[PDB]
Design an enzyme around this catalytic site. Sequence first.
Site, PDB file in Angstrom:
ATOM      1  N   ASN B  10       0.818  -1.231   0.000  1.00 39.67           N
ATOM      2  CA  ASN B  10       0.000   0.000   0.000  1.00 39.67           C
ATOM      3  C   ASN B  10       0.854   1.285   0.000  1.00 39.67           C
ATOM      4  O   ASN B  10       2.090   1.334   0.259  1.00 39.67           O
ATOM      5  CB  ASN B  10      -0.948  -0.011   1.201  1.00 39.67           C
ATOM      6  CG  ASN B  10      -2.318   0.517   0.889  1.00 39.67           C
ATOM      7  OD1 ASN B  10      -2.478   1.294  -0.052  1.00 39.67           O
ATOM      8  ND2 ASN B  10      -3.348   0.104   1.695  1.00 39.67           N
ATOM      9  N   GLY B  14       6.041   1.714   3.226  1.00 34.69           N
ATOM     10  CA  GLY B  14       7.471   1.835   3.511  1.00 34.69           C
ATOM     11  C   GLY B  14       8.365   1.273   2.425  1.00 34.69           C
ATOM     12  O   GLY B  14       9.492   0.901   2.710  1.00 34.69           O
ATOM     13  N   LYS B  15       7.895   1.322   1.168  1.00 33.35           N
ATOM     14  CA  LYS B  15       8.669   0.811   0.039  1.00 33.35           C
ATOM     15  C   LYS B  15       9.976   1.543  -0.260  1.00 33.35           C
ATOM     16  O   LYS B  15      10.985   0.912  -0.412  1.00 33.35           O
ATOM     17  CB  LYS B  15       7.802   0.626  -1.239  1.00 33.35           C
ATOM     18  CG  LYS B  15       6.860  -0.553  -1.068  1.00 33.35           C
ATOM     19  CD  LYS B  15       5.722  -0.506  -2.041  1.00 33.35           C
ATOM     20  CE  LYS B  15       4.572   0.365  -1.518  1.00 33.35           C
ATOM     21  NZ  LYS B  15       4.612   1.776  -1.939  1.00 33.35           N
ATOM     22  N   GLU B  34       9.699   3.018  -8.568  1.00 27.20           N
ATOM     23  CA  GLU B  34       8.523   3.514  -9.199  1.00 27.20           C
ATOM     24  C   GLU B  34       8.774   4.974  -9.532  1.00 27.20           C
ATOM     25  O   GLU B  34       9.138   5.739  -8.655  1.00 27.20           O
ATOM     26  CB  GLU B  34       7.392   3.341  -8.181  1.00 27.20           C
ATOM     27  CG  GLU B  34       6.013   3.332  -8.766  1.00 27.20           C
ATOM     28  CD  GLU B  34       4.971   3.041  -7.695  1.00 27.20           C
ATOM     29  OE1 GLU B  34       4.180   2.082  -7.894  1.00 27.20           O
ATOM     30  OE2 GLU B  34       4.983   3.792  -6.682  1.00 27.20           O
ATOM     31  N   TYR B  55      -6.127  12.131  -8.592  1.00 22.42           N
ATOM     32  CA  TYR B  55      -6.744  12.276  -7.295  1.00 22.42           C
ATOM     33  C   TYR B  55      -7.774  13.447  -7.180  1.00 22.42           C
ATOM     34  O   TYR B  55      -8.742  13.351  -6.410  1.00 22.42           O
ATOM     35  CB  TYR B  55      -5.703  12.433  -6.190  1.00 22.42           C
ATOM     36  CG  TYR B  55      -4.917  11.200  -5.872  1.00 22.42           C
ATOM     37  CD1 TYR B  55      -3.548  11.280  -5.699  1.00 22.42           C
ATOM     38  CD2 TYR B  55      -5.536   9.967  -5.695  1.00 22.42           C
ATOM     39  CE1 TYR B  55      -2.806  10.141  -5.384  1.00 22.42           C
ATOM     40  CE2 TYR B  55      -4.786   8.799  -5.415  1.00 22.42           C
ATOM     41  CZ  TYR B  55      -3.421   8.899  -5.271  1.00 22.42           C
ATOM     42  OH  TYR B  55      -2.642   7.797  -4.946  1.00 22.42           O
ATOM     43  N   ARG B  97       7.064  -2.056  -6.926  1.00 21.14           N
ATOM     44  CA  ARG B  97       5.800  -2.454  -7.558  1.00 21.14           C
ATOM     45  C   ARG B  97       6.059  -3.093  -8.918  1.00 21.14           C
ATOM     46  O   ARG B  97       7.238  -3.260  -9.355  1.00 21.14           O
ATOM     47  CB  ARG B  97       4.810  -1.286  -7.645  1.00 21.14           C
ATOM     48  CG  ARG B  97       4.258  -0.890  -6.209  1.00 21.14           C
ATOM     49  CD  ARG B  97       2.770  -0.448  -6.209  1.00 21.14           C
ATOM     50  NE  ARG B  97       2.359  -0.009  -4.861  1.00 21.14           N
ATOM     51  CZ  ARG B  97       2.333   1.244  -4.473  1.00 21.14           C
ATOM     52  NH1 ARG B  97       2.638   2.174  -5.304  1.00 21.14           N
ATOM     53  NH2 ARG B  97       1.956   1.588  -3.248  1.00 21.14           N
ATOM     54  N   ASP B 102      -0.009  -2.663 -10.821  1.00 23.55           N
ATOM     55  CA  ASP B 102      -0.628  -1.565 -11.593  1.00 23.55           C
ATOM     56  C   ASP B 102      -2.021  -1.942 -12.065  1.00 23.55           C
ATOM     57  O   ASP B 102      -2.986  -1.182 -11.902  1.00 23.55           O
ATOM     58  CB  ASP B 102       0.160  -1.173 -12.842  1.00 23.55           C
ATOM     59  CG  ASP B 102       1.468  -0.504 -12.549  1.00 23.55           C
ATOM     60  OD1 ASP B 102       1.663   0.131 -11.495  1.00 23.55           O
ATOM     61  OD2 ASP B 102       2.399  -0.611 -13.326  1.00 23.55           O
ATOM     62  N   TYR B 159       0.836  11.100   6.134  1.00 20.08           N
ATOM     63  CA  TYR B 159       0.985  12.336   6.882  1.00 20.08           C
ATOM     64  C   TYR B 159       2.450  12.567   7.161  1.00 20.08           C
ATOM     65  O   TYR B 159       2.949  13.654   6.939  1.00 20.08           O
ATOM     66  CB  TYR B 159       0.195  12.284   8.216  1.00 20.08           C
ATOM     67  CG  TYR B 159       0.542  13.393   9.216  1.00 20.08           C
ATOM     68  CD1 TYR B 159       0.017  14.687   9.103  1.00 20.08           C
ATOM     69  CD2 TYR B 159       1.437  13.148  10.257  1.00 20.08           C
ATOM     70  CE1 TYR B 159       0.373  15.686  10.036  1.00 20.08           C
ATOM     71  CE2 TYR B 159       1.787  14.132  11.180  1.00 20.08           C
ATOM     72  CZ  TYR B 159       1.246  15.379  11.072  1.00 20.08           C
ATOM     73  OH  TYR B 159       1.634  16.308  12.033  1.00 20.08           O
ATOM     74  N   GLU B 166      -0.987  13.271  -1.909  1.00 21.10           N
ATOM     75  CA  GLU B 166      -1.581  12.183  -1.178  1.00 21.10           C
ATOM     76  C   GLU B 166      -2.319  12.643   0.103  1.00 21.10           C
ATOM     77  O   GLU B 166      -3.007  11.846   0.737  1.00 21.10           O
ATOM     78  CB  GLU B 166      -0.486  11.154  -0.872  1.00 21.10           C
ATOM     79  CG  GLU B 166       0.207  10.674  -2.155  1.00 21.10           C
ATOM     80  CD  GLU B 166       1.322   9.667  -1.949  1.00 21.10           C
ATOM     81  OE1 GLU B 166       1.971   9.696  -0.910  1.00 21.10           O
ATOM     82  OE2 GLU B 166       1.546   8.848  -2.861  1.00 21.10           O
TER      83      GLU B 166
HETATM   84  N1  LIG Z   1       8.614   0.945   9.428  1.00 17.46           N
HETATM   85  C1  LIG Z   1       8.497   2.213   9.482  1.00 17.46           C
HETATM   86  N2  LIG Z   1       8.561   2.872  10.633  1.00 17.46           N
HETATM   87  C2  LIG Z   1       8.470   4.303  10.783  1.00 17.46           C
HETATM   88  N3  LIG Z   1       8.274   4.998   9.559  1.00 17.46           N
HETATM   89  C3  LIG Z   1       8.202   4.375   8.369  1.00 17.46           C
HETATM   90  C4  LIG Z   1       8.318   3.041   8.257  1.00 17.46           C
HETATM   91  N4  LIG Z   1       8.197   2.814   6.967  1.00 17.46           N
HETATM   92  C5  LIG Z   1       8.005   4.008   6.327  1.00 17.46           C
HETATM   93  N5  LIG Z   1       8.057   4.978   7.210  1.00 17.46           N
HETATM   94  C6  LIG Z   1       7.834   6.415   6.981  1.00 17.46           C
HETATM   95  O1  LIG Z   1       6.548   6.433   6.343  1.00 17.46           O
HETATM   96  C7  LIG Z   1       6.547   7.365   5.277  1.00 17.46           C
HETATM   97  C8  LIG Z   1       6.239   6.540   4.049  1.00 17.46           C
HETATM   98  O2  LIG Z   1       7.346   5.778   3.648  1.00 17.46           O
HETATM   99  P1  LIG Z   1       7.755   5.521   2.135  1.00 17.46           P
HETATM  100  O3  LIG Z   1       9.019   4.704   2.237  1.00 17.46           O
HETATM  101  O4  LIG Z   1       7.854   6.782   1.323  1.00 17.46           O
HETATM  102  O5  LIG Z   1       6.530   4.593   1.652  1.00 17.46           O
HETATM  103  P2  LIG Z   1       6.092   4.135   0.149  1.00 17.46           P
HETATM  104  O6  LIG Z   1       7.343   4.019  -0.648  1.00 17.46           O
HETATM  105  O7  LIG Z   1       5.563   2.774   0.279  1.00 17.46           O
HETATM  106  O8  LIG Z   1       5.118   5.249  -0.222  1.00 17.46           O
HETATM  107  C9  LIG Z   1       7.914   8.057   5.350  1.00 17.46           C
HETATM  108  O9  LIG Z   1       7.821   9.216   6.139  1.00 17.46           O
HETATM  109  C10 LIG Z   1       8.835   7.124   6.098  1.00 17.46           C
HETATM  110  O10 LIG Z   1       9.773   7.830   6.886  1.00 17.46           O
HETATM  111  N1  LIG Z   2      -0.459   1.949 -10.703  1.00 22.59           N
HETATM  112  C1  LIG Z   2      -0.346   2.867  -9.779  1.00 22.59           C
HETATM  113  C2  LIG Z   2       0.717   3.016  -9.083  1.00 22.59           C
HETATM  114  C3  LIG Z   2       0.750   3.940  -8.195  1.00 22.59           C
HETATM  115  N2  LIG Z   2      -0.260   4.709  -7.951  1.00 22.59           N
HETATM  116  C4  LIG Z   2      -0.166   5.793  -6.954  1.00 22.59           C
HETATM  117  C5  LIG Z   2      -0.077   5.428  -5.488  1.00 22.59           C
HETATM  118  C6  LIG Z   2       0.739   6.562  -4.904  1.00 22.59           C
HETATM  119  O1  LIG Z   2      -0.132   7.695  -4.669  1.00 22.59           O
HETATM  120  C7  LIG Z   2       1.694   6.968  -6.038  1.00 22.59           C
HETATM  121  C8  LIG Z   2       3.078   6.370  -5.910  1.00 22.59           C
HETATM  122  O2  LIG Z   2       3.046   4.967  -5.532  1.00 22.59           O
HETATM  123  O3  LIG Z   2       1.060   6.494  -7.242  1.00 22.59           O
HETATM  124  C9  LIG Z   2      -1.383   4.552  -8.658  1.00 22.59           C
HETATM  125  O4  LIG Z   2      -2.459   5.261  -8.500  1.00 22.59           O
HETATM  126  N3  LIG Z   2      -1.446   3.597  -9.577  1.00 22.59           N
END
Ligand SMILES: Nc1ncnc2c1ncn2[C@@H]1O[C@H](COP(=O)(O)OP(=O)(O)O)[C@@H](O)[C@H]1O
Ligand SMILES: Nc1ccn([C@H]2C[C@H](O)[C@@H](CO)O2)c(=O)n1
Lengths: 229, 229
Positions: B10, B14-15, B34, B55, B97, B102, B159, B166
Amino acid sequence: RIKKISIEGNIAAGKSTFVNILKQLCEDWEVVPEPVARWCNVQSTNGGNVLQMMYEKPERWSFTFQTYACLSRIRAQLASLNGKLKDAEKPVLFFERSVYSDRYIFASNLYESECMNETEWTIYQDWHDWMNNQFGQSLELDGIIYLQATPETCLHRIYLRGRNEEQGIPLEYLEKLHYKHESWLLHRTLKTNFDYLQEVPILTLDVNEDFKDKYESLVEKVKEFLSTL
Amino acid sequence: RIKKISIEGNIAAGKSTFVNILKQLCEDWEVVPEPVARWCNVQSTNGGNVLQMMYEKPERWSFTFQTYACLSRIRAQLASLNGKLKDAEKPVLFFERSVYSDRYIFASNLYESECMNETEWTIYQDWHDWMNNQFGQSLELDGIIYLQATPETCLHRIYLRGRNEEQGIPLEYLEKLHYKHESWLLHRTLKTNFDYLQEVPILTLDVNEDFKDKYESLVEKVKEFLSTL
Ligand SMILES: Nc1ncnc2c1ncn2[C@@H]1O[C@H](COP(=O)(O)OP(=O)(O)O)[C@@H](O)[C@H]1O
Ligand SMILES: Nc1ccn([C@H]2C[C@H](O)[C@@H](CO)O2)c(=O)n1
Ligand SMILES: Nc1ncnc2c1ncn2[C@@H]1O[C@H](COP(=O)(O)OP(=O)(O)O)[C@@H](O)[C@H]1O
Ligand SMILES: Nc1ccn([C@H]2C[C@H](O)[C@@H](CO)O2)c(=O)n1
């Protein structure tokens, strides 16, 4: 190789009519029609009519249509290359329109009319460049036949043909496409991203008169134009 | 060959965080993020933010976005194959991803929420099948790492991260994506058009807890999971 010729012209100038006399002139000539039928009934490879959706609301559906139109054309054109009714001997493949008319005539006109916004047009051009960098070279043209008719002749031929989707097409739209064709194919002033196109021979046939009376002359000119490539 | 692993999860699970610790574990590991940045500024290969456009008005822009998203991913993934920081010896390529998330997570959810209509969804599926029949086989996966977090954890991480686009994403949307991930990767009940995927090994990491405390365990589990493919 297989000689590749596109036939270009305005809506209802007489492309299918012209295309329908080619096969009888030579057993080695194949034709890839524009898939206007898959555009009128979208179905995996009774659905939406995306052609109709573009014309009813072009600022909503132009990008979707133009993208689908050109992908489905590239696919039908590729499939007829490897469609190996080549072997053949003296093989000619005629394309009803091209990826170049798709982008530089139709998609460009819709972008200039604000039916695609900058983001849509950026995406479309990027997709179109990328698609042709992969699946072109192989689609390159040895020649172009431009079927030339006034916008008013075409507006009349739309009435004659009676395709439901085209009946509300105004003269003004056809005139826009006319001038873009005239720039590309008569004046050769259109800039494209495809350098070799500037040099491709073009045959220009005036098809404003009635097809029966013109037929014999057209055939002579097609056969001669072919013999020179 | 090059082992190919996708990392799935999702929004804000934390990707990128996970991806940023991979390269330091092994000099032979490469990552294809991505391209979320090209989605936020559309530019040929300061423009539109198509992510933001989806969005703000998803029934208008979902098809365009989803189509652009997946094409740009396929391109970045291909370019890293032939990107020949292979040679390598023990090479692993991690995909942030996949073409399967997708289509089966994101595009599918938008179609089911009426943000794509039948014609859009038919076109998208046809493009997606066709794109993968050409430019896949080569993108096939040896494994999947599912980073699992509750929708509420993800809503909080959105957040934290503060990506402008987002911030208005409601819990309800994230929950929908959660269940689709859980169906594909936990219950393995999702039907796709890609038979081998049903058999692909999956590692599931619960990343709801804080990254610092989890790190050591995650690394053990990643290295072991890798050693078995
Ligand atoms: N395991 C975790 N513990 C604390 N913060 C996390 C963790 N995983 C992600 N975060 C925080 O959550 C937010 C989203 O992480 P992000 O790596 O950008 O997620 P995604 O790539 O899946 O959108 C960032 O602020 C990151 O610092
Ligand atoms: N096929 C995809 C892949 C990603 N996203 C969105 C989710 C996040 O808002 C942003 C980056 O992952 O793109 C999307 O709507 N559709
Ligand atoms: N030279 C011509 N003389 C009389 N009718 C023509 C001529 N060319 C085309 N037509 C008619 O005009 C209509 C449009 O022709 P069509 O071949 O479908 O055009 P296009 O393929 O370019 O849309 C048809 O009714 C056809 O019978
Ligand atoms: N790239 C294309 C090609 C064709 N058409 C339209 C013109 C006719 O209405 C129909 C069939 O040529 O499709 C279009 O809008 N864009």
